[PDB]
């Protein structure tokens, strides 16, 4: 029964973010966990620092691509489990980009590029670290090292959109000293969104009062947890990757369809969450061609969906038996999100979408002036039963040559 | 009881072809049927000839891309329903590429490029034509025009891999004079494969003795028809497009997953058919970026599957209850094609593929020396019951960093 | 093309009861036992000596048909095993007159049907395992088959129909159907002829279909004779009784299949296998009582209702049936209504739509309890949307039927 | 992770029980919740006591039917939400069978019948009660009334197999004084099984938790260092527990068999429910299900009682599973077809390899329980793989869940 604090309300309006995984692992192109899962010799793996040139990393291109896909923030891996830092740690560690041939603070380039495009920069930081022996040998000292690495991020790069922490699940029973860590963040970055990824086995959990967002990794839940009754509201976020891996994986051919990606983005909004779509950069920091294809396709959809994608919120309006349709609410309009439509041919050439296609909703109590598809402005016919709050629209199929996967009709009230 | 003629045997070894739709419709990017389905003014639509530059058509790059994806032939639209010819009709018509600014016989460039890459060139020819008034006003004269247009293709381009006719379904009861049309083809191109697409309502029918291949458009059948029992054997072919349209359609976002494309290719081989994977070129003749992504991903799979994709054939060996696995036979080996595998993590991090995974097959009666995955040469453990012809393998999951969608194990016999 | 009167009458029957009873019934391991279990023929045929029919009461069978809402009964007069349940008058010694029963069972059956206003139909297997003629002299077999049918055509008065089964065993043979059906037409001009095998002869009235045929059935060519259709269901996996077949379908599935038949424009036969001595088993009685509650409720539409070009909205299994005065919405996948405290699933407003109704509606009500439903129409697009309320607590009809009353 | 108490171990060996719903509601045949859900006038509904004759209740027939179906206990509704008691409450209430024309202690008849058949009598008791005003108007006094009603059951009927409490879910936040209620039960009936249908372990004295029918995974047996608790699932034949004449939505007999097998697989007991008629008879429809289930449980007798879940999984895409006794393993195999022949193809004809992972011991022989046919098999002992040719049913039979006994070397 609490409502979101302004910065959280601002976060929910972001809607869609791009997740970016890039580290030393990227050179191998066999997934970001390669060092542990393939049981590599650490010394040999860590030699990858010597060929980390970042020769194709262009933060401007990345920010441009995020803008074009309709993303409003980017979460970049500043340090993954491998423990290599993509920024200047100022003497905290020698395992950082300043000790690689790249010799560029990549996080500085990233934040400048985000600002030029009006995107919020978010920093992913692994809390489970494979590089520093402090992790197992002196946990209290490890917490200090982690906190210092975050402190550098809080003080050297201007205002930060958010932090995305990951790895506390590796030591479920430890005292991670979150009030000190989060408190430090609140001191230097009062407006930052704090996310703690509590991992696959503990979905929806709030690990500290300072947490703003709970995560659902890889897969969508049925409902988003918004925090205990009477406590601070926390937002939710789902994250998906295009194939089975987060870092680039050259021989992972198991990509989701573009259509499924569109349905997952719409679905997140339906259940009241943001969604992160992940891409893994190449070894040298380029967006791979495959990811570019997905971004172009999703980008066509998000441009069409712009009136509702950001401000639209769940509302107690359900769809009729046997359909996957749903409704989103802004302060001026309702929007019918309609799935499973077909292309329209003509009476001679039948594509599937030709016949009258009544789609009903329960929970709309106000007389409607008009309804129209966002993609082409066609006006739909509809009937209402105001007492039972029933709306029925004839959801016409796609014009030949197009197929939006999730089609959106805007409702204009009297 | 008949066996395939040599040319048809050669056809079945092709396995995979690339279908290419390119015409005036391409400039509009709203599907190849746009002229009819969107009720365009014919005069105005046909003005698209004036901006047909083919400025980005490079037959060499196209043939190279076909070779890299593992295709062994290409079917190119020489004339679609719109009735515009991509070749020099030598006085038959003014509605051809020689009267467009391109001024290049595109079919000549195509055939030369195919030959350099050892690909068979196939010519798609629409028999239902929206351009010539002969079609409705004087059908007998239309048949003469169609036959002459095919005759030009038969005499001016060297040996032709095949012809892919489409549109007889528009007049199911007409006499199309197939003996004369196919007799002419047999005269000039005795070795050509003749395919007649009998359309969605008439799957797998033989419209003349000269037909070599029956088609199944868009969708896969349960069984491939090989002709009436004592008659000429005919091969089968399934055709699929990446989204919902054959020509390019910019706002059709409803793409199939790469994984489904891989499964459909494997499936086609399982049931004893070739498969055509379709791309629509841009207005100026380029392979679009999205199609390139699919070709790169499918290309990794077909390179791995090369030992079996071409020579492999269906064999009476079935898989155990509840699996989608199947077997292909070459003269030296059997190959287990195994679906629904997961990635292998480790003891600590579980991804799904870790446990022993017994997959059984019924119909293998010969003792086996060894079994190994094509992708990494790992040796699989197995047991046999020779009397009941049971084989059981432990189908290990993918090494982290990879996912082949359909994984293939080669059997080596004693 | 218009159905002949007898075929129009047939389609109004709607539901029939199929009865399988033969020597196989004594073994209670399915009607194909002789062939599938590779039994010694001589030994199997000895079952004639214990065929007493001690518990066969044709009146109880006719009563069970009436209670289930069936309008005809198809009885196995001779199955593949080749034993005749009637007096063949010298054609064969392998008939009920040579068994201890010593009763013409078909005569008792026809009298019982008549008393209950039901049509008697005779199943006759054309694939026969008894007579050596079948393999050793096919032309003479056809004569024997025809004679056995002739006895049925001439000794019992007017018959409802004949249900032939087995031509599929020899798909390429000449069965001499014009002679066989011509003989039937001579003695029994009004009888329905069904062939369980596509139309194999002009005299066929009804073809059989697979119970899961999705689409409305084939009625023959535009200028040809109209042929009706029929689907069949058995309660478990076997037609004759099978004591250790526990794989019974749900009553709900049986109800759905009966409704589905009407939706695609077919009759439906529900099968029971009698015990060795001719009794209806207790399990079959349970199904009859449950289906019988449904068919009594559905009576306004079950007989006269016909398919009509009105489709249901996306993701629904709902369908419409038409009589001359009314349309009926047949609505599936409803839930029971509890309250605010006790949620059973059927509580919320439940809009179910249909496309193809162009006339203004006065009133719509459920057949089971007369509750009036609210609805809206778009007459131009022919859309109807009803609030299909869920079942009153304590009931669940599986297929619920709403009658439409027009203005 | 501790070992079950003797009484609980004995409970798990019961395997299958019959649930029986019978009360005043039965006379209306529109479900057991009719009084509340149909918003009936309380005074008028409660008049049903005057026609409660029990004229067709025969506890002996009920116990016989339970025995024949292979059930080892019966849970009878002694008082449902309607609040009418099927036993002599000895002055606690006038709304009991002694004030109805029946004038017979039905629970006494029930316990005697169970004993003659070697079945454990269990008493269902609704804790959510619609009759007494105490329930809403004076909850502390209600708890006393409930406890007294249970006390009568604990002192007047000899040793009681168990109690099956239902209704605490109506007031999830209330203090139900379970230490006192269960403490009283422990005093008079130390060996009784206590089940609380929570709609979680609500008190240390609970022996059995109830679970959903469709629970996929092996059940929760209590926190790691604490008392082991058993599990139980329930199924009814249609949508209602009391009789409901116009509820035609019956499950298939096949689904009932699969649910019984499934309960064993997850390590639970299962209750199959029947609702008696107004006058206390088993309806004909219920009899059909019991005859069918009975055929299956008689065949499954070697494993149904003593069989327990074990870490042996089935191959990809099958629903097969394994149960373990001290002498044998049993393969429970689903989705088989009938065997015809080459000419008449019924589906079960081909070799049908079904695999399991987790068996590490060499096997001597495997055979179907229904007909003793010996199955062929191969093993890979290092990877613990077993593959059997699971032959289809002989024509004329179909067991739904077929069971193969494994005999070890
Ligand atoms: C988003 C994912 O979440 C974590 O749990 C990591 O282990 C993965 O590598 C990835 O970063
Ligand atoms: C392969 C497809 O087949 C035909 O039927 C054409 O009408 C389509 O446009 C396309 O070329
Ligand atoms: C109705 C069924 O149909 C036939 O084909 C027979 O072979 C069956 O035994 C049964 O009579
Ligand atoms: C077994 C069922 O369990 C309870 O929750 C009751 O409310 C039902 O009526 C029935 O007794």
Domain architecture of chain D: domains with CATH: 6-304 (3.20.20.80), 313-408 (2.60.40.1180)
Q: Where are the alpha helices (DSSP H) in C202-316?
A: 251-264, 282-302
* For ligand 3, mutation pick of C31, C83, C237, C268 (most atoms within 8 Å of CB): C31
Q: How far apart are CA D161 and CA D12, in angstroms?
A: 13
With beta carbons less than 8 A apart as the criterion, state whether A374 and A339 touch: no
Q: Where are the alpha helices (DSSP H) in A106-242?
A: 106-116, 134-137, 139-155, 178-188
Chain D within 8 Å of B352 (Cβ-Cβ)? no
How far is C-alpha C58 from the geometric centre of its chain's CA atoms?
A: 18
Query: Which one, of D200, D193, D202, lies nearest residue D219 by Cα?
Result: D200
* DSSP annotation of A96: B
* For ligand 3, mutation pick of C82, C206, C239 (most atoms within 8 Å of CB): C239
The residue whose CA has the least distance to atom 11 of ligand 4 is: D241
Distance from the B255 Cα atom to the nearest Cα atom in chain A, whole angstroms: 6
Contact C351 A340 (CB under 8 A): no
Chain A within 8 Å of B201 (Cβ-Cβ)? no
Phi, psi of C271 (to 5 degrees): -95, 140
- Partners of A393 in the β-ladder: A359, A382
- Partners of B344 in the β-ladder: B399
Q: How far apart are CA A211 and CA B209, in angstroms?
A: 74
CB neighbours of residue A231 within 10 Å: 12
| Ligand 3 binding pocket includes C239 (Cβ within 6 Å) | yes
With beta carbons less than 8 A apart as the criterion, state whether D276 and D312 touch: no
Searching chain B, which residue's CA lies closest to the CA of residue D333?
B321
Q: How far apart are CA C351 and CA C330, in angstroms?
A: 14
Tell me which residues of chain A, numbers 239 to 278, contact chain C at a CB-CB cutoff of 8 Å. none
Q: How far apart are CA A308 and CA A331, in angstroms?
A: 11
Nearest ligand for residue A36 CA: 1
Q: How far apart are CA D382 and CA D357, in angstroms?
A: 11
CB < 8 Å to B362, chain D = 350-353
- Partners of A330 in the β-ladder: none
End-to-end Cα spacing for chain B: 31
Distance from the C381 Cα atom to the nearest Cα atom in chain A, whole angstroms: 7
Q: What is the SS3 string spanning chain B?
A: CCCCCHHHHHHHHHCEEEEEECCCHHHHCECCCHHHHCCCCHHHHHHHHHHCCCCCCCHHHHHHHHHHCCCCEEEEEEECCCCCECCCCCCCCCCEHHHCCCCCCHHHHHHHHHHHCCCEEEEEEECCCCCCCHHHHCHHHHHHHHHHHHHHHHHHCCCCCEEEEECHHHHCCCCCCHHHHHHHHHHHCCCCEEEEECCCCCCCCCCCCCCCEEEEECCCCCCCCCCCCCCCCCEEEEEEECCCCCCCECEECCCCCHHHHHHHHHHHHHHCCEEEEEEECCCCCCCCHHHHHHHHHHHHHHHHHHHHHCCCECCCCEECCCCCCEEEECCCCEEEEEECCCEECCCCCCCCCCCCCEEEEECCCCCEEEEEECCCCCECCEEEECCCCEEEEECCCEECCEECCEEEEEEEEC
Distance from the A358 Cα atom to the nearest Cα atom in chain C, whole angstroms: 6
With beta carbons less than 8 A apart as the criterion, state whether A259 and A301 touch: no
CB neighbours of residue C176 within 10 Å: 15
Contact A340 C314 (CB under 8 A): yes
How far is C-alpha B94 from the geometric centre of its chain's CA atoms?
A: 31
Searching chain A, which residue's CA lies closest to the CA of residue C389?
A388
Secondary structure (DSSP) of D282-327 = PPHHHHHHHHHHHHHHHHHHHHHTT-B--S-EEPTT---EEEE-SS
Q: How far apart are CA C186 and CA C177, in angstroms?
A: 14
Query: Which one, of A105, A45, A71, lies nearest residue A279 by Cα?
Result: A71
With beta carbons less than 8 A apart as the criterion, state whether C141 and C131 touch: yes
Tokens coding D368: 């179907």
Q: How far apart are CA D242 and CA D81, in angstroms?
A: 12
Resolution of the PDB structure in angstroms: 2.3
Q: What share of chain C is helix, strand, coil (3-state, %, to 5)?
A: 30, 25, 45
Nearest ligand for residue D236 CA: 4
Nearest ligand for residue D35 CA: 4
CB < 8 Å to D257, chain C = 246
Name the one residue in this structure whose structure tokens are 């058919």: B273
Q: How far apart are CA D278 and CA D57, in angstroms?
A: 9
Searching chain B, which residue's CA lies closest to the CA of residue D391?
B388
Searching chain D, which residue's CA lies closest to the CA of residue B362?
D351
Searching chain B, which residue's CA lies closest to the CA of residue D347?
B321
Q: How far apart are CA B269 and CA B236, in angstroms?
A: 10
Query: Which one, of D248, D277, D210, D222, lies nearest residue D17 by Cα?
Result: D210
Chain D within 8 Å of C36 (Cβ-Cβ)? yes
Query: Does B contact C via 3+ CB–CB distances below 8 Å?
Result: no
Dihedral sign of CA atoms B33, B36, B40, B44 in order: positive
Q: Given D316, D383, D389, which is nearest B359 (Cβ)?
A: D316
Chains adjacent to D (≥3 CB pairs closer than 8 angstroms) = B, C
Distance from the B184 Cα atom to the nearest Cα atom in chain A, whole angstroms: 32
Q: Given D37, D253, D344, which is nearest C36 (Cβ)?
A: D344
Long-range contacts of D203-209 (CB under 8 A, 24+ apart): D203/D178, D203/D179, D205/D178, D205/D179, D206/D182, D207/D5, D207/D7, D207/D8, D207/D11, D207/D162, D208/D8, D208/D11, D208/D162, D208/D232, D208/D269
Q: Given C35, C286, C394, which is nearest D284 (Cβ)?
A: C286
Searching chain D, which residue's CA lies closest to the CA of residue B390?
D353
Nearest ligand for residue C195 CA: 3
The residue whose CA has the least distance to atom 10 of ligand 1 is: A246
Contact C393 D30 (CB under 8 A): yes
Gyration radius of chain D's alpha carbons:
23
Tokens coding D334: 């689903």
CB < 8 Å to B343, chain A = 244
- Partners of B27 in the β-ladder: none
CB < 8 Å to D395, chain C = 29-30, 32-33, 36-37
* For ligand 3, mutation pick of C165, C270, C272 (most atoms within 8 Å of CB): C165
Searching chain A, which residue's CA lies closest to the CA of residue B405?
A254
Contact B251 A38 (CB under 8 A): no
Q: Residues A211, A217, A222, CA angle at the centre, nearest 5°?
A: 90
Angstrom distances, CA of residue C89 to CA of C49, C63, C147, D394:
19, 29, 10, 38
Tell me which residues of chain C, numbers 286 to 305, contact chain D at a CB-CB cutoff of 8 Å. 286, 289-291, 293-294
Query: Which one, of C23, C392, C92, C5, lies nearest residue C241 by Cα?
Result: C23
**Backbone φ/ψ region at C370: left (φ over 0), alpha (ψ -120 to 50), beta:** left
Contact C387 A385 (CB under 8 A): yes
End-to-end Cα spacing for chain D: 30
Q: What is the SS3 string spanning D122-188?
A: EEEEECCCCCCCHHHHCHHHHHHHHHHHHHHHHHCCCCCCEEEEECHHHHCCCCCCHHHHHHHHHHH
CB < 8 Å to B360, chain D = 315, 353, 355, 387
Q: How was this structure determined?
A: X-ray
Angstrom distances, CA of residue D147 to CA of A204, D135, D183:
41, 13, 11
Phi, psi of A38 (to 5 degrees): -90, 10
Q: Is A198 helix (H, G, I), strand (E, B) or coil?
A: coil
Q: Residues B194, B139, B163, CA angle at the centre, nearest 5°?
A: 15
Cα-Cα-Cα-Cα dihedral of C295, C299, C301, C305, to 10°?
A: 80
Contact D378 B356 (CB under 8 A): no
Of ligand 1's listed atoms, the one at least distance from the Cα of A32 is 9
- Partners of B163 in the β-ladder: B123, B194
Query: Which one, of A232, A233, A234, A230, lies nearest residue A215 by Cα?
Result: A234
Q: How far apart are CA C210 and CA C215, in angstroms?
A: 11
Tokens coding C316: 């629904």
If residue C161 lies in a helix (H) or strand (E), which one and from where to where? strand C161-165
- CA–centroid distance, D396 to ligand 3, in Å, is 14
| Ligand 2 binding pocket includes B166 (Cβ within 6 Å) | yes
Secondary structure (DSSP) of C323-368 = -SS-EEEEE-S--EE--SSS--S--S--EEEEE---S-EEEEEETT
Q: How many CB pairs under 8 A join C and D?
A: 138
With beta carbons less than 8 A apart as the criterion, state whether C109 and C73 touch: yes
Q: How far apart are CA A385 and CA B158, in angstroms?
A: 70
Angstrom distances, CA of residue A31 to CA of A279, A308, B129, D151, D309:
12, 35, 52, 66, 37
With beta carbons less than 8 A apart as the criterion, state whether D121 and D76 touch: yes
Phi, psi of D6 (to 5 degrees): -45, -45
Contact A402 B346 (CB under 8 A): no
Q: Given C36, C246, C282, which is nearest D341 (Cβ)?
A: C36
Nearest ligand for residue B170 CA: 2
| Ligand 3 binding pocket includes C77 (Cβ within 6 Å) | no
Q: How far apart are CA B340 and CA B363, in angstroms?
A: 22
Angstrom distances, CA of residue A46 to CA of A51, A52, A83, A95, A130:
10, 11, 10, 9, 11
Angstrom distances, CA of residue B323 to CA of A18, B318, C35:
36, 10, 33
Which residue of B326, B341, B356, B371 to mutate against D (max D Cβ within 10 Å)? B356
Long-range contacts of B150-153 (CB under 8 A, 24+ apart): B150/B125, B150/B181, B150/B184, B150/B185, B151/B184, B151/B188, B152/B87, B152/B88, B152/B89, B152/B90, B152/B92, B153/B78, B153/B87, B153/B107, B153/B123, B153/B125
Of ligand 4's listed atoms, the one at least distance from the Cα of D169 is 5
* For ligand 2, mutation pick of B19, B163, B166 (most atoms within 8 Å of CB): B166
Chain A within 8 Å of C323 (Cβ-Cβ)? no
Query: Which one, of D227, D324, D221, D218, lies nearest residue D263 by Cα?
Result: D218
* DSSP annotation of A379: B
Query: Which one, of C382, C370, C362, C371, lies nearest residue C320 by Cα?
Result: C382
Query: Which one, of B55, B31, B7, B4, lies nearest residue B286 by Cα?
Result: B55
């Amino acid at each position: 029964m609490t409502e979101p604090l302004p910065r959280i309300q601002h976060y929910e309006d972001l809607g869609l973010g791009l997740f970016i995984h890039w580290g030393l692992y990227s050179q191998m192109a066999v997934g970001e966990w390669t060092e542990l899962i393939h049981h590599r010799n650490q010394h040999d793996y860590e030699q990858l620092i010597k060929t980390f040139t970042a020769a194709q990393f262009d933060a401007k291109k990345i920010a441009h691509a995020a803008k074009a896909v309709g993303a409003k923030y980017i979460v970049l891996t500043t340090k993954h489990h491998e423990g290599f830092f993509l920024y200047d740690t100022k003497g905290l560690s020698d395992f950082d980009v300043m000790h690689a041939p790249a010799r560029r603070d990549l996080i500085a380039e990233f934040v400048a590029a985000c600002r030029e495009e009006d995107l919020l920069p978010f920093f992913y930081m692994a809390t489970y670290d494979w590089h520093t022996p402090l992790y197992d040998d002196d946990f209290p000292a490890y917490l200090t090292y982690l906190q210092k690495s975050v402190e550098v991020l809080c003080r050297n790069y201007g205002p930060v959109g958010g932090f995305w922490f990951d790895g506390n699940w590796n030591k479920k029973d430890a005292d991670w000293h979150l009030p000190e860590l989060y408190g430090m963040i609140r001191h230097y970055q009062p407006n930052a969104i704090i996310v703690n990824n509590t991992g696959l086995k503990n979905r929806g959990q709030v690990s500290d009062p300072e947490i703003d967002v709970v995560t659902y990794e890889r897969r969508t839940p049925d409902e988003i947890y918004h925090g205990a009754p009477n406590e601070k509201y926390v937002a939710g976020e789902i994250s998906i990757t295009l194939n089975q891996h987060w870092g680039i994986a050259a021989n992972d051919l198991n990509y989701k369809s573009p259509a499924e990606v569109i349905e997952t983005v719409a679905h997140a909004r339906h259940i009241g969450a943001n969604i992160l779509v992940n891409i893994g950069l190449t070894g040298t920091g380029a967006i791979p061609a495959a990811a570019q294809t997905y971004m172009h396709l999703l980008g066509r959809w998000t441009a069409m969906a712009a009136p509702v994608l950001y401000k639209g919120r769940p509302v107690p309006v359900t769809s009729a038996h046997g359909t996957r349709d749903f409704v989103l609410h802004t302060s001026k309009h309702d929007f019918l999100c309609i799935l499973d439509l077909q292309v329209v041919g003509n009476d001679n050439v039948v594509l599937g979408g030709e016949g009258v296609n009544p789609r009903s909703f329960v929970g709309i109590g106000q007389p409607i002036q008009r309804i129209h598809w966002l993609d082409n402005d066609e006006v739909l016919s509809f009937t209402q039963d105001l007492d039972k709050k029933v709306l029925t629209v004839d959801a016409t199929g796609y014009p030949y040559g197009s197929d939006w996967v999730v089609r959106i009709a805007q409702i204009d009230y009297e």
